[PDB]
Design a protein around this nucleic acid. Structure first.
Ligand SMILES: [K+]
Ligand SMILES: [K+]
Ligand SMILES: [K+]
Ligand SMILES: [K+]
Ligand SMILES: [K+]
Ligand SMILES: [K+]
Ligand SMILES: [Mg+2]
Ligand SMILES: [Mg+2]
Ligand SMILES: [Mg+2]
Ligand SMILES: [Mg+2]
Ligand SMILES: [Mg+2]
Ligand SMILES: [Mg+2]
Ligand SMILES: [Mg+2]
Ligand SMILES: [Mg+2]
Ligand SMILES: [Mg+2]
Ligand SMILES: [Mg+2]
Ligand SMILES: [Mg+2]
Ligand SMILES: [Mg+2]
Ligand SMILES: [Mg+2]
Ligand SMILES: [Mg+2]
Ligand SMILES: [Mg+2]
Ligand SMILES: [Mg+2]
Lengths: 101, 138, 313, 132
RNA sequence: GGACCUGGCGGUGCUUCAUAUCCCUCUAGAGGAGCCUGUUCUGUAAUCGAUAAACCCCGAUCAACCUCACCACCUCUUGCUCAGCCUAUAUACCGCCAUCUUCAGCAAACCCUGAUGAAGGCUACAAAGUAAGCGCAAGUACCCACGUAAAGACGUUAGGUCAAGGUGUAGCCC
C-alpha cells in the first residue's frame, strides 16, 4: 500500500539498516582507528563487506512520503516541492506563508 | 438561586521539606501571530500581578526563515515560489519566586497556551554549597 | 446586497446590547464604554495577526460598517420626489443648479491649508457615482465662485467642499541640551547609514577632538574620504576646532560608518547653531537619513537588477 | 499564469466561500491557517509528523461526514489535546451527528494516542462569500 | 462571381513616443585561450523529458552502489497492495506552469443603431449606451507615502509536463 515499488524498496532498506546499525557501528569502530593490528582490521573489513547490501545506510533515499518523489524534497516536512506547495498554498501548513520582501 | 451551599476546596498540604527558590524564571513564548502573543502577554502579566509575582516583559527580535521552491512541476527553472515562516517572541521574566509559586503560575499559563504557541521556560534555581566543598580535606 | 432601514435598525439594537455584554465581559462600566475600549477588548478576545487590518475581527457601529444607501426616490403613486430624478444624477445636477443659481445672483447684485475634496469624497456627500469630467465641471464652477465677490452665505457653501489638509513642517527638530557631572553642556543624537548605526555626543565647547569607539578619528578612519565626511558638518557651519565629539558606531563598513557618524554629529550639532544655520544644514543634505540600502536579489536573475544572459538564439 | 489554489472567474454563478475566494498570497494577510501547531516554529521538532496527521484527519473527516462538511476543517493542537472544528450542514439527523462524533473522537483518540475532541458548528447552507 | 463585415497582415500612412530602451550615447561582459557544466552529433548491449523567442547548471535546492526509470544475465507468478505497469496518448485531462504581461483589458444581463445583415455603440460647450463581476488600481509584505517584491484577468502558442501524484481511452497479465 506504499506509493510505489521504489518507496517499498526504500522502506525495506530503512528497516534492514535499522537492524544492522549496531553491528555495523561496532565493526566500523575496529576499522576507524590506527590502534588495532592491520591483521585484525583486515578481517573487520571483510566482515562489514559481507553484510547484506541493503543494510548500508548510504542506499537509503529520502523520498516524498506521499508521492515517493526522490528529488525536490524538503527534509523538515519529508514532502516534495509539489506536495509541500499544495498544502502550503491552501493554508494547511501551520505558520507557512508566501515570502515577500 | 440554584447556587452551591458549600464548596470542596482542593487539598493543599504544607510539607516539612524546604521549598525551592528560583532567582529567575525566563518564559520565552514563540508564535506565528503577534496579536496572539500580545493577548497571551496581557493574560500572563495580569496573572502574575494578582499572584504577587514580579514580572518584566520584552520582545526579542523576530526570526524569518525563507526558502525557495520551483514553481512549475517540470522545467522553467527561472520561475520560483518563495515561502517563509515567521517566528515572533515574547519573554516574560519573573523574579524571586518559590518553587510552589512557580508550579502554580506555570501550570496556570501553560494550560492556557494558545494553539500555535510554544513556550521555553528557563528556571534558575538558588542552591547552597555542597557540604563536601565547604572545607578542604587536605 | 441592499440594506433596508428596518435591517439597520435591528443591527443597531444588537450592537447596543452586545456593547453592554462586551463591557460586562471585561468588568468595565457599560455606560462609559467607548469605541476605543471596544476595539481594545475585541483585539484581546479575538487576537488576529492578519497583516490587513480590514480582515481582522471588528465590532463597530452599524453606521460605520454598512455602506450608505440612497432611500427610495418615489412614493406609492410612483411620482419621484425630486424634480431632477429623470436625469439619473439628481443630487449632482441639483448641486450644479444651486451653484449656477448663486453665480447669477451675484451679477445681479454686482490655499495653503485647504484643498478641494476628491471625487471619492464628493461621491459620498451626494451618495451617487460620478465621472471624472463631472467632478472637474463641478470644481471649475466652484473656482468661478471664489473669483466673484462671494458673501458670507456664498462662503459657508464653498467651505463644505473644501477639506483641511495638515501640512507637515520640514523644520528640523532640535535635541535637548544636557549637562554632565562636570557641568559641560552637550547634545546627543543618532544616525543610520546602510547597516551602520551611530550615536554621537557633541559637546558645546571643545578643541575639535573626535573619539570613535574610544579611538582618535584619524586612527579609526585611516581613509581620507571617511575623514572628509566627519569634517563636512562642522566645516559647513564654520565650527572646525570648536566642539569635542565622542561617538560610537556599529555595523556596516568603513564608509557606511562615516556616513552614520556624519548624520549623528550633524543632528546633535543642531543644538548649538542658530535656526537659520539648521535650515542651511537641512538644505545641504546633512540632516536627511539616506534611504539607499542594498536591494534584495530576486530568484531567476543574477542580481538585484542584473538578469541572466539571454541565451544566444 | 498562476494556478495554485485559485478559483477562477466564471459567469457569476459559482458560489465560493471566503476560504476559496483568496489565493495563496493572501495567506497571513486576509486568511489565516487551517491548522495551528508548534511544529513550524523556529527550534521546534516533529513538523513532518504533524503534517501527515493533518492530511489524514482532513481525508478522514471528509469520508466520515460525507456530504456534510460545509467548509475546510480547522485543526487546533494544545499540549497533547487535538481539537477538530468543523462547519457542517443541517441535513443529517442529530442522532447521526452524535453517533459520528462519538465514533470519530474515540477512533481518532486510539489512532493518534491523544485526547481528540470534535466541535461541530451547523449552518443551514454553505456560506457564500461571493459569486465568481 | 458581385458587394460588404470581422480579424490578421502590409519592405503600410500621419502624429506622438519608448528610457536600461528602438537608434546614438554610458559601464562591464560574451564571441578568442584553458577549465567547469548543459546540449547536439558520433560512439555504446545500455533511459526518459525540455529543446525559436518561451530549450540548453532545464525536471536535478544535484547520478560512484542506491537513486534508476536503461542494458546484459539469472530468478519469481494471486505477486508490498481486495494486484501491478516510468506501457501508448500532454492532440482526452486534473494538478502546477511558460508566454505576450516591461500588457489593460475581459464580460454576464439589458438598451439602442444598421430598413431588425455579418456587425456597431464615442464627441463633456457631449451626439446611445447602462453596465454586475474579474483584472489593473487600491490595500498588504520588506526599511516610508519611494523602491523592490507580490499580484497580473479573459484569451494566445492542441506551448511544457501521463516520468510529481491522480486520471479518461487503448494496451500488457509466466
Ligand atoms: K483590417
Ligand atoms: K571574451
Ligand atoms: K563562454
Ligand atoms: K495541462
Ligand atoms: K501523470
Ligand atoms: K494515463
Ligand atoms: Mg544519497
Ligand atoms: Mg553584480
Ligand atoms: Mg510568473
Ligand atoms: Mg539593454
Ligand atoms: Mg569562449
Ligand atoms: Mg538528453
Ligand atoms: Mg524529445
Ligand atoms: Mg514533448
Ligand atoms: Mg544495480
Ligand atoms: Mg546506477
Ligand atoms: Mg517497467
Ligand atoms: Mg498542451
Ligand atoms: Mg508599494
Ligand atoms: Mg514578479
Ligand atoms: Mg495589484
Ligand atoms: Mg503539443
Amino acid at each position: 500500500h506504499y506509493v510505489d515499488w521504489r518507496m517499498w524498496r526504500d522502506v525495506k532498506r530503512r528497516k534492514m539498516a535499522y537492524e544492522y546499525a549496531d553491528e555495523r557501528l561496532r565493526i566500523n569502530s575496529l576499522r576507524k582507528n590506527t590502534i588495532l593490528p592491520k591483521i585484525l582490521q583486515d578481517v573487520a573489513d571483510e566482515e562489514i563487506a559481507a553484510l547484506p547490501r541493503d543494510s548500508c545506510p548510504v542506499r537509503i533515499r529520502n523520498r516524498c512520503v506521499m508521492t515517493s518523489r526522490p528529488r525536490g524534497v524538503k527534509r523538515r516536512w519529508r514532502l516534495s516541492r509539489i506536495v509541500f506547495r499544495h498544502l502550503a498554498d491552501h493554508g494547511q501548513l501551520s505558520g507557512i506563508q508566501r515570502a515577500t520582501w | 438561586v440554584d447556587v452551591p451551599k458549600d464548596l470542596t476546596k482542593p487539598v493543599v498540604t504544607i510539607s516539612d521539606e524546604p521549598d525551592i527558590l528560583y532567582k529567575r524564571l525566563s518564559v520565552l513564548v514563540k508564535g506565528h501571530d503577534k496579536a496572539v502573543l500580545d493577548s497571551y502577554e496581557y493574560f500572563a502579566v495580569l496573572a502574575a500581578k494578582e499572584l504577587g509575582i514580579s514580572i518584566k516583559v520584552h520582545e526579542p527580535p523576530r526570526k524569518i526563515e525563507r526558502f525557495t521552491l520551483l514553481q512549475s512541476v517540470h522545467i522553467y527553472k527561472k520561475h520560483r515560489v518563495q515561502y517563509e515562516m515567521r517566528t515572533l517572541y515574547r519573554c516574560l521574566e519573573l523574579e524571586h519566586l518559590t518553587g510552589s509559586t512557580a508550579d502554580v503560575y506555570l501550570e496556570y499559563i501553560q494550560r492556557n497556551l494558545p494553539e500555535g504557541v510554544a513556550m521555553e521556560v528557563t528556571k534558575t534555581q538558588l542552591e547552597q554549597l555542597p557540604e563536601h566543598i565547604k572545607e578542604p580535606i587536605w | 446586497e441592499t440594506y433596508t432601514e428596518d435591517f439597520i435598525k435591528k443591527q443597531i439594537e444588537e450592537f447596543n446590547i452586545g456593547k453592554r455584554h462586551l463591557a460586562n465581559m471585561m468588568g468595565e462600566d457599560p455606560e462609559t464604554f467607548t469605541q476605543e475600549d471596544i476595539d481594545r477588548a475585541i483585539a484581546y478576545l479575538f487576537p488576529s495577526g492578519l497583516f490587513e487590518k480590514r480582515a481582522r475581527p471588528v465590532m463597530k457601529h452599524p453606521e460605520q460598517i454598512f455602506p450608505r444607501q440612497r432611500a427610495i426616490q418615489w412614493g406609492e403613486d410612483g411620482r419621484p420626489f425630486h424634480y431632477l430624478f429623470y436625469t439619473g444624477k439628481q443630487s449632482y445636477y441639483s448641486l450644479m443648479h444651486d451653484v449656477y443659481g448663486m453665480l447669477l445672483n451675484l451679477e445681479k447684485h454686482q490655499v495653503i491649508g485647504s484643498r478641494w475634496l476628491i471625487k471619492e469624497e464628493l461621491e459620498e456627500m451626494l451618495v451617487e457615482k460620478l465621472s471624472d469630467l463631472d467632478y472637474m465641471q463641478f470644481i471649475r464652477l466652484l473656482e468661478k465662485l471664489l473669483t466673484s465677490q462671494c458673501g458670507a452665505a456664498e462662503e459657508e457653501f464653498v467651505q463644505r467642499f473644501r477639506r483641511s489638509v495638515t501640512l507637515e513642517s520640514k523644520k528640523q527638530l532640535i535635541e535637548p541640551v544636557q549637562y554632565d557631572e562636570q557641568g559641560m553642556a552637550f547634545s546627543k543624537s543618532e544616525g543610520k547609514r546602510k547597516t551602520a548605526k551611530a550615536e554621537a555626543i557633541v559637546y558645546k565647547h571643545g578643541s575639535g577632538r573626535i573619539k570613535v569607539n574610544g579611538i582618535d578619528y584619524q586612527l579609526y578612519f585611516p581613509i581620507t574620504q571617511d575623514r572628509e565626511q566627519l569634517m563636512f558638518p562642522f566645516h559647513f557651519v564654520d565650527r572646525l576646532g570648536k566642539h569635542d565629539v565622542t561617538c560610537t558606531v556599529s555595523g556596516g563598513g568603513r564608509s557606511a560608518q562615516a556616513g552614520a557618524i556624519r548624520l549623528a554629529m550633524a543632528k546633535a550639532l543642531c543644538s548649538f547653531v542658530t535656526e537659520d544655520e539648521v535650515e542651511w544644514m537641512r538644505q545641504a543634505g546633512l540632516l536627511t537619513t539616506d534611504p539607499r540600502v542594498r536591494e534584495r536579489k530576486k530568484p531567476g536573475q543574477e542580481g538585484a537588477r542584473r538578469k541572466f544572459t539571454w541565451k544566444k538564439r | 499564469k498562476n494556478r495554485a489554489a485559485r478559483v477562477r472567474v466564471s459567469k457569476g454563478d459559482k458560489p465560493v466561500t471566503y476560504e476559496e475566494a483568496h489565493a495563496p498570497h493572501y495567506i497571513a494577510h486576509r486568511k489565516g491557517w487551517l491548522s495551528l501547531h508548534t511544529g513550524n516554529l523556529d527550534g521546534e521538532d516533529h513538523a513532518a509528523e504533524r503534517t501527515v496527521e493533518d492530511v489524514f484527519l482532513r481525508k478522514f473527516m471528509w469520508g466520515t461526514f460525507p456530504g456534510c462538511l460545509a467548509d475546510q476543517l480547522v485543526l487546533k493542537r494544545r499540549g497533547n489535546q487535538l481539537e477538530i472544528c468543523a462547519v457542517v450542514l443541517r441535513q443529517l439527523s442529530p442522532h447521526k451527528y452524535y453517533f459520528l462524533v462519538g465514533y470519530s473522537e474515540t477512533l481518532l483518540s486510539y489512532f493518534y494516542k491523544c485526547p481528540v475532541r470534535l466541535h461541530l458548528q451547523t449552518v443551514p447552507s454553505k456560506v457564500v462569500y461571493k459569486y465568481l
